[PDB]
Amino acid sequence: QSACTLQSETHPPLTWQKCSSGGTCTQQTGSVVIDANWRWTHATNSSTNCYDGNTWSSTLCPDNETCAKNCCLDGAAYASTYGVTTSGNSLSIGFVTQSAQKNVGARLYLMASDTTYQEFTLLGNEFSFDVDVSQLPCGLNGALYFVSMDADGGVSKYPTNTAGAKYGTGYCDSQCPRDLKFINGQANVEGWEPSSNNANTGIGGHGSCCSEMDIWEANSISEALTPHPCTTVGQEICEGDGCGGTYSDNRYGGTCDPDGCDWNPYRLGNTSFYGPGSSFTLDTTKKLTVVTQFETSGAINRYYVQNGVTFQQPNAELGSYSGNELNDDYCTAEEAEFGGSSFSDKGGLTQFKKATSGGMVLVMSLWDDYYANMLWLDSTYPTNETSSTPGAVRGSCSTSSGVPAQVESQSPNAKVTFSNIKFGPIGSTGNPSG
Numbered sequence: 234q235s236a237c238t239l240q241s242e243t244h245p246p247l248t249w250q251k252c253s254s255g256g257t258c259t260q261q262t263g264s265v266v267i268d269a270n271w272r273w274t275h276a277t278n279s280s281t282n283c284y285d286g287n288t289w290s291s292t293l294c295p296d297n298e299t300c301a302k303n304c305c306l307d308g309a310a311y312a313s314t315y316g317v318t319t320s321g322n323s324l325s326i327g328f329v330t331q332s333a334q335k336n337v338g339a340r341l342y343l344m345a346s347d348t349t350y351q352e353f354t355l356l357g358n359e360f361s362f363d364v365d366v367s368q369l370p371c372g373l374n375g376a377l378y379f380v381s382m383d384a385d386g387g388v389s390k391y392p393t394n395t396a397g398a399k400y401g402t403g404y405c406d407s408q409c410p411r412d413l414k415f416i417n418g419q420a421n422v423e424g425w426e427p428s429s430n431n432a433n434t435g436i437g438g439h440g441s442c443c444s445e446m447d448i449w450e451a452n453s454i455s456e457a458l459t460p461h462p463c464t465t466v467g468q469e470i471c472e473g474d475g476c477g478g479t480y481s482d483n484r485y486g487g488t489c490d491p492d493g494c495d496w497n498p499y500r501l502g503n504t505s506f507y508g509p510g511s512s513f514t515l516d517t518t519k520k521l522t523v524v525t526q527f528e529t530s531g532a533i534n535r536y537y538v539q540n541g542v543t544f545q546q547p548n549a550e551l552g553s554y555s556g557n558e559l560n561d562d563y564c565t566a567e568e569a570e571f572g573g574s575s576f577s578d579k580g581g582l583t584q585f586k587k588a589t590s591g592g593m594v595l596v597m598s599l600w601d602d603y604y605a606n607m608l609w610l611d612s613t614y615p616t617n618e619t620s621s622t623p624g625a626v627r628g629s630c631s632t633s634s635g636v637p638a639q640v641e642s643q644s645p646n647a648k649v650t651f652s653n654i655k656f657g658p659i660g661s662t663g664n665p666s667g
């Protein structure tokens with residue numbers, strides 16, 4: 234796709250701290266850009282939609298190549314259309330935003346320049362941020378995560394994409410998402426199936442795969458930390474059901490692990506660690522700090538700070554694993570006790586280390602789940618299971634929660650705020666911001 238300019242594109246600025254082993258931090262100035270799927274896609278020479286509702290123009294988009302030639306992405310009104318605001322080091326994402334039309338959520342990338350994504354090499358480093366999840370009820374996911382995207386959004390590889398990172402192209406993750414309207418500089422109109430329960434989305438014949446580091450998927454009730462390896466580390470197109478992922482009839486028929494090695498303290502048995510009010514170790518009515526450390530072994534360590542009190546990730550015992558480090562032994566014990574072979578099939582933390590050794594793009598999002606109502610994160614899943622099924626209970630939300638139309642109707646003013654991002658060598662991010 235190309236870029237059009239009927240609406241101007243001004244990325245909301247966002248600063249963050251880069252810290253060094255010598256004990257100081259220095260401010261970086263970036264910005265955020267919304268993913269291309271949220272944008273208006275229209276004819277290059279008019280205001281005629283190439284995509285509208287959940288169907289493509291059969292004349293502008295008779296096939297993937299012709300579509301990309303005929304069509305462009307336009308700019309985003311971040312606050313008024315998408316409910317996205319920034320202030321200094323803080324980013325807020327609103328849930329439902331009513332303008333001339335209804336918008337739900339956003340997926341945003343941190344940029345290095347107005348035309349390039351910021352890369353982060355996670356291995357040997359740590360990432361800290363503050364979050365307010367107080368306005369996130371059951372069924373919502375305020376997410377902060379990393380994916381192995383190209384810094385240009387795919388332009389160098391696919392010259393029929395001239396819009397690039399400036400317009401949020403190039404996304405991929407471990408679901409090999411097939412809901413993307415453009416992949417590899419071609420549209421995804423071929424094989425398009427409009428969603429049965431979402432007026433705005435569908436699934437196409439291509440998907441876009443890559444490694445995914447879910448540092449934070451959470452609401453006020455539940456939170457999880459989940460690496461997802463893929464056999465190809467970076468962005469790679471996939472074909473139809475061969476994609477695997479939640480967008481395919483077989484979730485395990487592909488190159489990526491769509492489940493991951495999740496660490497959810499509630500799911501592991503500590504139901505008192507995280508939740509709303511003073512009965513929990515971490516009170517989700519209040520801002521908290523989340524620090525995630527990627528030691529060179531490939532294991533992941535985690536601690537939290539709230540009101541100046543520090544808590545490591547709580548200890549868990551699962552099979553013969555005992556501890557609070559997300560390592561090989563944890564992930565293997567998890568598969569043994571809870572089930573599954575996706576994470577290990579895709580090479581586990583050894584394969585994941587290839588992703589964190591390289592560059593990854595920072596993603597911040599707010600979303601509801603039209604496939605499984607976020608029950609996999611904050612409820613009992615599958616919903617016919619009980620607490621007697623190991624790992625089935627991931628949070629205290631009702632198995633009836635998270636119906637998108639319902640949460641959109643009941644909780645439109647839900648929001649997530651991410652702030653005070655700091656990144657640097659392990660041990661460095663608690664030192665003073667510059």
Ligand SMILES: OCC(CO)NC[C@H](O)COc1cc2ccccc2c2ccccc12
Pocket residue numbers: 374376378406407408445447450461479491492598602603604605609
């Ligand atoms: O929060 C960021 C998100 C980006 O894709 N990470 C999701 C991350 O890959 C696990 O994804 C899912 C995992 C999942 C597991 C069981 C049931 C359903 C799902 C599901 C349904 C819809 C969408 C995603 C999932």
Ligand SMILES: *[C@@H]1O[C@H](CO)[C@@H](O)[C@H](O)[C@H]1NC(C)=O
Pocket residue numbers: 502503504505506514544545546547548
């Ligand atoms: C949950 O984790 C916190 C922090 O590690 C700990 O203090 C608390 O005692 C744990 N409770 C349970 C039930 O495991």
Ligand SMILES: *[C@@H]1O[C@H](CO)[C@@H](O)[C@H](O)[C@H]1NC(C)=O
Pocket residue numbers: 615617618619
């Ligand atoms: C839940 O349903 C699935 C598929 O129908 C089945 O495999 C599983 O045994 C069920 N569990 C219970 C507790 O009945």
Ligand SMILES: [Co+2]
Pocket residue numbers: 439472
């Ligand atoms: Co194809």
Ligand SMILES: [Co+2]
Pocket residue numbers: 528530532558
């Ligand atoms: Co260690």
